[PDB]
UniProtKB/Swiss-Prot annotation, chain B:
Family as reported in the entry's similarity comment: Belongs to the peptidase T1A family.
Protein name listed in UniProt: Proteasome subunit alpha type-1
Residues carrying Phosphoserine: S236
Xref: InterPro entries: Ntn_hydrolases_N (IPR029055), Proteasome_alpha (IPR050115), Proteasome_alpha-type (IPR023332), Proteasome_asu_N (IPR000426), Proteasome_sua/b (IPR001353), Proteasome_subunit_alpha6 (IPR034642)
Lineage of origin: Eukaryota, Fungi, Dikarya, Ascomycota, Saccharomycotina
Function (record text): The proteasome degrades poly-ubiquitinated proteins in the cytoplasm and in the nucleus. It is essential for the regulated turnover of proteins and for the removal of misfolded proteins. The proteasome is a multicatalytic proteinase complex that is characterized by its ability to cleave peptides with Arg, Phe, Tyr, Leu, and Glu adjacent to the leaving group at neutral or slightly basic pH. It has an ATP-dependent proteolytic activity.
Quaternary state and interactors: The 26S proteasome consists of a 20S proteasome core and two 19S regulatory subunits. The 20S proteasome core is composed of 28 subunits that are arranged in four stacked rings, resulting in a barrel-shaped structure. The two end rings are each formed by seven alpha subunits, and the two central rings are each formed by seven beta subunits. The catalytic chamber with the active sites is on the inside of the barrel. Interacts with CIC1.
Cross-referenced SUPFAM superfamilies: N-terminal nucleophile aminohydrolases (Ntn hydrolases) (SSF56235)
Amino acid sequence: GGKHTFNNENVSARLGGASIAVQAPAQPPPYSHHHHHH
Amino acid sequence: SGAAAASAAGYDRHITIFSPEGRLYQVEYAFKATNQTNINSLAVRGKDCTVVISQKKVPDKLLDPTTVSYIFCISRTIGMVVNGPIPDARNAALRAKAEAAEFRYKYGYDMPCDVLAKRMANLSQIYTQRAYMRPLGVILTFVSVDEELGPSIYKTDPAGYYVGYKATATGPKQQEITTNLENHFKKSKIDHINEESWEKVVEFAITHMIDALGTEFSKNDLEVGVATKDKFFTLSAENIEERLVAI
């Protein structure tokens, strides 16, 4: 009744994103006004 | 890793903060200022006569070169040459010239370069304790012909370190020079140098900061000092014309 094949391949890309990280050192100011400047 | 945790976690904008390495960094960043002119002095001893030399650059023609100078006659028997920007050289020059004086008003004689390098350096420490003042971005040399010690060179840096060398140079180009007289001294084993005349000792020190410096010099690109008993002063231009004729 049917002679064709299908050949289900992985022609599609894909991805899994949980790029979870730790540090975040971005920007500590301990001199918000330099604390008497002097 | 060296200054990575420095440049990020403070430690580079307050003076009075140590790093866990022990290093404070602000004063260790002052020295980069000393070389902001690309200038390179020198100093040497004598039998009784001392000398110090400096370049004096050739900028745009509009200057009046009589006044461009990094040689400041402080008092008599004393003098100094700086390594760093001009304005941060004056405030050291003037805080001194009004300091040799009061001594002579308060103790009855003129200071040597010993004390004058211990006093002014006993101050640049203080300004690295308190936040009174950013430490002056210089490193300065002194000279004298003392009565009790003979010739004498001294040196001072923004922390407060001071030692009386036998001969030295400074600037961006110390290694080239310093070797071209370190090797000279191990020849003869004389802390001082011969050639009694303050004249003949100049031409020694010129030519060593020619061969090891990297080019040839005219009369205008230089300015030179000298110290002799009772005096300190500056000089004329013929001393090289009476060199190359002999060679």
